[PDB]
Tab-separated table of C-alpha atoms and ligand atoms in Angstrom:
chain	number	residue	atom	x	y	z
Y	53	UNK	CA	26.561	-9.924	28.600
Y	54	UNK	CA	25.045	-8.150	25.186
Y	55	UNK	CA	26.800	-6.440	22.452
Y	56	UNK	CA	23.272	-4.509	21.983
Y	57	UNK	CA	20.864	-4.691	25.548
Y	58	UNK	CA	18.212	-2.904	24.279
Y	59	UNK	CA	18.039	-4.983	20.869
Y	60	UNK	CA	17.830	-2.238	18.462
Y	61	UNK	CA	21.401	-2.027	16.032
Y	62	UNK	CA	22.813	0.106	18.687
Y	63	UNK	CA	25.601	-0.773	21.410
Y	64	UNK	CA	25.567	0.137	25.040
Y	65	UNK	CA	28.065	2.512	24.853
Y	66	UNK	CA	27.094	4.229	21.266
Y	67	UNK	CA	22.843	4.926	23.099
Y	68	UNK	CA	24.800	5.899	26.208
Y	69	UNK	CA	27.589	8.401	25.132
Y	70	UNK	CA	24.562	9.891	23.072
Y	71	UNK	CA	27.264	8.986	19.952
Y	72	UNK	CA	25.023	8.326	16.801
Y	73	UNK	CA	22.183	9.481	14.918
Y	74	UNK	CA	21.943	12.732	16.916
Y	75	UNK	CA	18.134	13.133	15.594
Y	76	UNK	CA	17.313	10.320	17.607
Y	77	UNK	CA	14.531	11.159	20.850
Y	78	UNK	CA	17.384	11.735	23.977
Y	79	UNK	CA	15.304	9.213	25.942
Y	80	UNK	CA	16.806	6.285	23.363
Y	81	UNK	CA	19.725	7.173	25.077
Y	82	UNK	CA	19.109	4.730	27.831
Y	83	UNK	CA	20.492	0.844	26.972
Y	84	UNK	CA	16.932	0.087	27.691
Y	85	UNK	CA	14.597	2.124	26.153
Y	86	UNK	CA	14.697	0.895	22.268
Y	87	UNK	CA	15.889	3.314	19.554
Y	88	UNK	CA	12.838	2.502	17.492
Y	89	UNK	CA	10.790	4.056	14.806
Y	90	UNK	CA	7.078	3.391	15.509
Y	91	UNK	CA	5.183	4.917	11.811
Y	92	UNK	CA	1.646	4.805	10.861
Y	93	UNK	CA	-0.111	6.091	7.675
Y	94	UNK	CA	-2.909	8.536	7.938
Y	95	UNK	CA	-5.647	9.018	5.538
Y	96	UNK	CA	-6.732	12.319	4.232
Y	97	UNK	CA	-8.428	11.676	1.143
Y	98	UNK	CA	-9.482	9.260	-1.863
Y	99	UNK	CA	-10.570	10.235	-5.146
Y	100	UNK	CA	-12.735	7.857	-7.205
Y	101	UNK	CA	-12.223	8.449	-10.808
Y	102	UNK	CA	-14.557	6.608	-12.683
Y	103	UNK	CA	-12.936	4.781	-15.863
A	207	UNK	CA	-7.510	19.833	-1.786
A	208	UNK	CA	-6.196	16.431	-2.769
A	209	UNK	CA	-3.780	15.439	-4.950
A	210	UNK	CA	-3.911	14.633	-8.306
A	211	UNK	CA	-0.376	12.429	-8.238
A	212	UNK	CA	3.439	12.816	-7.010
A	213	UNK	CA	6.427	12.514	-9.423
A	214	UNK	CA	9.790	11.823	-8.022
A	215	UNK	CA	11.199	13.176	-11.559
A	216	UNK	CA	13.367	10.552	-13.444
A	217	UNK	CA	16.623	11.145	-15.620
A	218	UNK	CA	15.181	13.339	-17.940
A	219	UNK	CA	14.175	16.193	-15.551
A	220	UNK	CA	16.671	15.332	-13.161
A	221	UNK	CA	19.737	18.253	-11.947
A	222	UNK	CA	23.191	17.039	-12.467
A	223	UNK	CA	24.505	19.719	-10.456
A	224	UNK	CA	23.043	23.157	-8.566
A	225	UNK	CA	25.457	25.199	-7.016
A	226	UNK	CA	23.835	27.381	-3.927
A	227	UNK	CA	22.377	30.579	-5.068
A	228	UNK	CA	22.217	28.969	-8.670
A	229	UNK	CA	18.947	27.795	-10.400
A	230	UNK	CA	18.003	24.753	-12.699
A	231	UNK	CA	17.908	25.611	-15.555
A	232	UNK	CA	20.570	27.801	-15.323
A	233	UNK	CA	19.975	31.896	-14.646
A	234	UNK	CA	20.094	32.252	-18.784
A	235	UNK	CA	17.170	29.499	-20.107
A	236	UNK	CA	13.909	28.969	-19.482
A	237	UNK	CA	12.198	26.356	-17.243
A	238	UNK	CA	12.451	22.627	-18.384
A	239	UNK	CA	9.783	20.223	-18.593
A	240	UNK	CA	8.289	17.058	-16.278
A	241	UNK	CA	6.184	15.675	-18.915
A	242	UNK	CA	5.253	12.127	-16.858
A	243	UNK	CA	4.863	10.277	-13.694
A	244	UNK	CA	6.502	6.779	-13.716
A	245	UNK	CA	10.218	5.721	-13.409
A	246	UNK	CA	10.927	5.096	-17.062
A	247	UNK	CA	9.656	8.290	-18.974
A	248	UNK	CA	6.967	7.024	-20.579
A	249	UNK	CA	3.345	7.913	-19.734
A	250	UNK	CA	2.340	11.432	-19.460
A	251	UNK	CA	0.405	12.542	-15.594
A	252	UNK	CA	-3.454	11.718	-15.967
A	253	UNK	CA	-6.516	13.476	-14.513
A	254	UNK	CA	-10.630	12.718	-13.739
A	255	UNK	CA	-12.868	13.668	-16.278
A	256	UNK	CA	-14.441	16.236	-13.808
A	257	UNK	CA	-11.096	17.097	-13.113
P	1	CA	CA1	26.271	-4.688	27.279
């Protein structure tokens, strides 16, 4: 009774015949598990100059 | 180590086109110039004064 189960912009059919952005994790092919990009920003340095 | 900034090059040193095994400039001139940072061509890259 959903267009989209899983939520994400992707249809039943496109996450299960693996038809779509083929860089997507093959898991994500499962109308349940959401297509879904989880991004954090890591640190590495600062630099302080003084004005 | 770090980094002193990042330039996504505007207009002026942009490439209009680069066919494959080609070079920009071209195999005849000599390298062009990014003179500055922001999007509009304006203000030159800075550095620290212990830099
Ligand atoms: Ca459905």
């Amino acid at each position: 009774l959903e267009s989209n189960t899983a939520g994400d912009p992707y249809t039943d059919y496109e996450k299960a015949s693996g038809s779509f952005d083929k860089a997507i994790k093959t898991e994500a092919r499962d109308p349940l598990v959401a297509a879904y990009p989880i991004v954090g920003v890591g640190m590495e340095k600062l630099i302080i100059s003084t004005n | 180590g770090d980094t002193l900034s990042t330039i996504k090059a505007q207009e002026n040193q942009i490439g209009n086109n680069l066919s494959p095994g080609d070079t920009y400039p071209k195999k005849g001139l000599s390298p062009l110039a990014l003179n500055t940072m922001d999007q509009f061509s304006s203000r030159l890259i800075p550095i620290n004064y212990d830099q």
